[PDB]
């Protein structure tokens, strides 16, 4: 055109939408910290499920 548009605003809106979608999904803090927290939560859920299975299946009383 100038051989003789709104890219900045478009990029800003795209970045805002991506940040909103990440904060809705969980991308609001550092990635390594979020991954460690997710692994810890999964380990805690697995331990709770294992404890429930061990306390429910092998019933002491009858």
């Amino acid at each position: 055109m100038d051989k003789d548009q709104d890219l900045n605003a478009l990029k800003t809106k795209f970045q805002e939408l991506r940040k909103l979608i990440g904060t809705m999904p969980g991308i609001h803090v550092s990635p390594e910290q979020q991954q460690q927290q997710l692994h810890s939560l999964r380990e805690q859920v697995r331990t709770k499920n294992e404890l429930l299975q061990k306390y429910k299946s092998l019933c002491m009383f009858e």
Binding site: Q44, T47, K48, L51, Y55, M60, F61
Partner: peptide, 21 residues
């Protein structure tokens, strides 16, 4: 004895739940 065993199992479950959080 049955009530004490149930209470011990419940205490163990509660301690595990507290330790898991």
């Amino acid at each position: 004895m049955l009530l004490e065993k149930i209470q011990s199992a419940l205490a163990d479950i509660a301690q595990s739940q507290l330790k898991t959080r």
